[PDB]
Design a protein around this ligand. Structure first.
Ligand code: HEM
Ligand code: HEM
Ligand SMILES: *[C@@H]1O[C@H](CO)[C@@H](O)[C@H](O)[C@H]1NC(C)=O
Ligand SMILES: *[C@@H]1O[C@H](CO)[C@@H](O)[C@H](O)[C@H]1NC(C)=O
Ligand SMILES: *[C@@H]1O[C@H](CO)[C@@H](O)[C@H](O)[C@H]1NC(C)=O
Ligand SMILES: *[C@@H]1O[C@H](CO)[C@@H](O)[C@H](O)[C@H]1NC(C)=O
Ligand SMILES: *[C@@H]1O[C@H](CO)[C@@H](O)[C@H](O)[C@H]1NC(C)=O
Ligand SMILES: *[C@@H]1O[C@H](CO)[C@@H](O)[C@H](O)[C@H]1NC(C)=O
Ligand SMILES: *[C@@H]1O[C@H](CO)[C@@H](O)[C@H](O)[C@H]1NC(C)=O
Ligand SMILES: *[C@@H]1O[C@H](CO)[C@@H](O)[C@H](O)[C@H]1NC(C)=O
Ligand SMILES: [Ca+2]
Ligand SMILES: [Ca+2]
Ligand SMILES: [Cl-]
Ligand SMILES: [Cl-]
Lengths: 595, 595
């Protein structure tokens, strides 16, 4: 009767109990229960799934079954009516740089990924779905409402395919449907080294015995490396400028080339790794290839954990930081380290921090060349603007000296994402990130807004004026009640995101609780956390406290002037300093060709 | 391009190829390319892998994809109709003692291992495969055919898990699924010393500096030693008699105590190393433990190469010993030392040589005790009968004086193995080594029987009449044809073993060809061959050419009567002599004077 049985298609590897390095897939982190946290298992559930048929079909599937007696509004309709806006004057964040958002997306892609389903195989309805807008098995199209502009221009729907789910992957019931997390739940740089060993091998240079990651052999960036090319065909990156025909970048994470600043950051992280490998061959000429790669991999992971928890989270969570992430007390093999399903929608608050333009800047942080400012929608899956427009220096400069978009109850998500998103399988710049996220909620069986308030110890509004008081916004609350009829039906994504931000934070109270818990459970339940005594010698810890994003940029670009607190809003040159001023990671405590 | 980069599960540790000994891992034997021969590597392909989808899926996987236009028969069905027999009377080989059988297993176990995907640990893949028999991923269950008695007593299937494979390790498509050889390819005593360092270091006595192998403290064979126990749980050797609960032994090879006479041989080998170790300290009290360990290791290394090539191979290969293994013309460092994939199935000819019983014999070679002859299947993973019942001396005595089973086209595999094999994981003596072999050729993507005849320059029959003449057998040929429809589809393991033995040998021409080739590469491609110049002095070579299996028993048991050829049939006492006869291993040239 115990529900610890299901889970057929997945590896089952046995563990090295006293190995000092993480696995690639994440097995063997926990000893009593070793699959906890590993790639390619079911996402954790903090509250049971909720489906139209209690089983797998999403709310809004059958054009009749209500939800608690009310119909659910169209997802694109919720986008048009609440999420969009036209004017981009005055939307930026006066205290968060563009780096603030980009680190959010990079940490997201370390923690979770729920990919659409391989099925749609060598067949003929991955297109008829796209071509006739007919819901079918795993094709769940997003229908345009009346008067929606896209009707005059994109037919009747946007494509949408549901996310993959455990045990038999195309079957007959399976308790409630549960979606797969295809990466590791530990904050462990899976996005650099991969979460599957076929991929992790292919991403390394194993021809030499130096512990490096493979690098491209077609282009260079003033002698600094680029990611290798993912040569599989067809390429969404080649598709958007078939003249240039530059492929997408191959990295530890499937999403690396989705937008050019994300691809920019994947480069920094990979350059850093190789930088450690040849420094450690210097200090330790006797170390082999395996030793070098494993030991560099462990430093970049701590590097990522420290920046996340000391520089990023405090300015996300604000007044809720120490109430969810109190001081580390040591590893606790009872804590669940799995990412929750609901976490993979709470973290999509960043979609409202994405601004509508992206800049390249020159040595003095002035516009670089004639077209320094490009619209974001022309940079989805755009690699040729890296290779054939100056490499990554002008973009990293934009990350430091420009700004994130600010959350705003009357200007939620930029149209560059709300109408002009590009999706790699399809061909047009016509999609709606906002509608996707709302359709993904229901697909994942998310419980309503008020189930998660209750879950977070929060007041559960029932009326207009209750909602008006929670949202501190009477107009907005009126629109949502028109659309959903009861706060019990508000999809968690727009729900969590509609709440004003806590003090010195960048989310509201509901979302602060959700993310706060999850980051709690992923520090405390990881056997390889960096503070965990025994992972790193106490001398190594005191070197890793000096890490900075600023120093990361120094060591792996040709940028000589950077700020000291890269996450805040910094202007040139007042808040900029020289790159020998900043502090280095001192490798000497890693010298171990011991007697 | 030249993807010499795939092959993920690897370290490196570099080496010291100015070192006078072997490595445990087997790397650094070939200088141009150090990994040729190393543990944890892809098996070599003498012919390309052949699969349903040309990638990873075995023939027989999809009940709808023929091979050459016909469905492949079920493995258990072929085993029922071809390989079984009822009367063990008259089956014994009139001129091969039991040690001939045993010595084949010990050579095999040194050279190749391809463990089933050990990805099956506290997890319901094992039991989903066992109790529900549902194909999927690495579960490749052996379905029972129509009328199979085991239907009534064991269920629908026998469980089976596909062998491991390189770069990816759980997932799928490769240039071809290439399975792993988990031990060193060299005739090198890796079954005694182990093939990875972790295990290799644990088997050693590093509490004193005498260079000995850890020995068992709990029990002793009249003052002689036993292998140390294995305290990991659950213990299959405890399973088969919890009240006795004597655990399996822990040797340099996973499967050391799979049957009581295999464990026996292992105990002889340990006793020899430590013997050399303590007789080496005497000549050279100025030698450390590590020097004693290696030097003993090396001699034992030589002895295993001597017995195999001087005494075993001529009687297996017969009239084809010369054509495939001509006398030694020195190390050739462009010969591939690897074990091919097909060889691991070719060497399973020894399966048809395992008789139905095992004896114990007292000092006069008469039945020993109130239970002297025991059925084979009561002795899978049986160690209490070693340590609780007389020790090994009675068991050794049977090996000398009892006969091997002769191969036989109407009496191929005894039911002890064909119907009552014990598998470590499961609870029942009820598996089928025959069906596992045929199932395993398909896992390993083996080509058919006529692909392998051609490769050996043999005739490729297409007819009942051509297969009749090849097999010199009317009845057997038709039973193959009706099951396989075309000789091209006959799994190599049964086609090769179906052929009449060559004159003076114990395998047919196809096997003699695949066996002969490999052993030739095993000799010519090993930089550390006992007859390569510089390896051993010319003087030490004079010594080693007089070691004997008849000597090795005298030096490590309390047996005083051995025949001069322990490999042929010998009845007590007409063919037995007293140990004062059979020449020793004079260790004088191992005396290193200080001058
Ligand atoms: C294009 C996209 C972005 C930038 C140009 C972008 C940005 C972010 C940030 C900054 C995030 C967090 C701090 C973040 C979170 C998550 N996203 Fe998003 N995002 C872009 C585009 C997408 C697309 C397309 C998806 C797929 C949605 C679907 O269901 O098909 C997407 C998802 C996510 C996500 C969930 C990951 C998962 O487990 O599946 C986030 C946590 N983003 N994005
Ligand atoms: C060679 C050889 C192999 C394959 C080694 C490899 O994996 O590369 C082999 C295998 C086995 C197995 C596992 C088979 C599978 O699951 O695929 C079992 C359970 C088993 C049992 C016994 N064997 Fe064997 N065997 C090989 C060779 C030989 C030889 C060679 C001369 C003899 C003799 C022998 C004997 C026995 C045996 C005796 C009682 C048992 C039990 N094996 N083998
Ligand atoms: C592997 O390493 C060598 C340097 O040791 C380098 O020249 C080569 O280009 C690397 N290969 C790749 C694919 O990065
Ligand atoms: C395509 O790429 C080339 C660079 O090779 C660039 O010069 C050109 O302007 C690009 N065109 C478009 C439409 O993006
Ligand atoms: C470990 O986690 C559990 C579950 O949340 C908690 O009850 C317990 O207090 C924790 N233990 C320690 C020592 O912090
Ligand atoms: C920007 O944010 C940080 C942390 O929230 C804070 O220390 C700093 O004072 C803020 N700046 C302004 C102008 O509020
Ligand atoms: C047994 O066979 C071997 C095979 O080489 C042969 O040499 C021997 O003569 C045979 N037995 C006897 C007793 O001759
Ligand atoms: C190691 O060698 C010493 C020397 O006799 C012995 O006392 C000790 O028991 C040995 N240990 C093992 C495990 O063999
Ligand atoms: C268990 O072992 C004891 C001897 O140690 C023996 O008497 C008994 O028969 C064995 N039981 C079984 C079931 O083999
Ligand atoms: C050495 O082996 C190579 C392997 O290709 C083979 O060509 C040749 O016959 C052998 N020659 C010598 C001199 O060993
Ligand atoms: Ca991860
Ligand atoms: Ca070996
Ligand atoms: Cl602030
Ligand atoms: Cl003979």
């Amino acid at each position: 009767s115990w529900e610890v049985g299901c889970g057929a298609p997945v590896p089952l590897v046995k563990c090295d109990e006293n190995s000092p390095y993480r696995t690639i897939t994440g097995d063997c982190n926990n000893r009593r229960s070793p699959a906890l946290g590993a790639a390619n298992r079911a996402l954790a559930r903090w509250l049971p799934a909720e489906y139209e048929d209690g089983l797998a079909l999403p709310f809004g599937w059958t054009q009749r079954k209500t939800r608690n007696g009310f119909r659910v509004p169209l997802a694109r309709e919720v986008s048009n009516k609440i999420v969009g806006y036209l004017d981009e004057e005055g939307v930026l964040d006066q205290n968060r740089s563009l780096l603030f958002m980009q680190w959010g997306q990079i940490v997201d892609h370390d923690l979770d990924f729920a990919p659409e389903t391989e099925l749609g195989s060598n067949e003929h309805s991955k297109t008829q779905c796209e071509e006739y807008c007919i819901q079918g098995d795993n094709c769940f199209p997003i229908m345009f409402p009346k008067n929606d502009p896209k009707l005059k221009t994109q037919g009747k729907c946007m494509p949408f395919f549901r996310a993959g789910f455990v045990c038999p992957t195309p079957p007959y019931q399976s308790l409630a449907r549960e979606q797969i997390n295809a990466v590791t739940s530990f904050l462990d740089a899976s996005l650099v080294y991969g979460s599957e060993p076929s991929l992790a091998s292919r991403l390394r240079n194993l021809s030499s015995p130096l512990g490096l990651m493979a690098v491209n052999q077609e282009a260079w960036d003033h002698g600094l490396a680029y990611l290798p090319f993912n040569n599989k065909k067809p390429s969404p990156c080649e598709f958007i400028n078939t003249t240039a025909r530059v492929p997408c970048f191959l990295a530890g994470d499937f999403r690396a080339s989705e937008q050019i600043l994300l691809a920019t950051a994947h480069t920094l992280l990979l350059r850093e790794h190789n930088r450690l490998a040849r420094e450690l061959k210097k200090l330790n000429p006797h170390w082999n290839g395996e030793k070098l790669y494993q030991e560099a991999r462990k430093i970049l992971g701590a590097f990522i954990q420290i920046i996340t928890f000391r520089d990023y989270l405090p300015i996300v969570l604000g007044s809720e930081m120490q109430k969810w992430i109190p001081p580390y007390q040591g590893y606790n093999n009872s804590v669940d380290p799995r990412i929750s399903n609901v976490f993979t929608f709470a973290f999509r608050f960043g979609h409202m921090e994405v601004p509508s333009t992206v800049s390249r800047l020159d040595e003095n942080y002035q516009p670089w060349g004639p077209e320094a400012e490009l619209p974001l929608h022309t940079l989805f899956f755009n690699t040729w603007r890296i290779i054939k427009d100056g490499g990554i220096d002008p973009l990293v400069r934009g990350l430091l000296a420009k700004k994130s978009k600010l959350m705003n109850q009357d200007k939620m998500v930029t149209s560059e994402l709300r109408n002009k998103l590009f999706q790699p399988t399809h061909k047009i710049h016509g999609f709606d990130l906002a509608a996707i996220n709302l359709q993904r909620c229901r697909d994942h069986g998310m419980p309503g807004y008020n189930s998660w308030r209750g879950f977070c110890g929060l007041s559960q509004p029932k009326t207009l004026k209750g909602l008006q008081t929670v949202l501190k916004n009477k107009i907005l609350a009126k629109k949502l009640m028109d659309l959903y009829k009861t706060p019990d039906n508000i999809d968690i994504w727009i729900g969590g995101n509609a709440e004003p931000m806590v003090e010195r934070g960048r989310v509201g109270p509901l979302l602060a609780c959700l993310l706060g818990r999850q980051f709690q459970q992923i520090r405390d339940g990881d056997r390889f956390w960096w503070e965990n005594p025994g992972v790193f010698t106490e001398k190594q810890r005191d070197s890793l406290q000096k890490v900075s994003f600023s120093r990361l940029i120094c060591d792996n670009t040709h940028i000589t002037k950077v700020p000291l607190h890269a996450f805040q809003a910094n202007n040139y040159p007042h808040d900029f300093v020289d790159c020998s001023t900043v502090d280095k990671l001192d490798l000497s405590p890693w010298a171990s060709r011991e007697n």
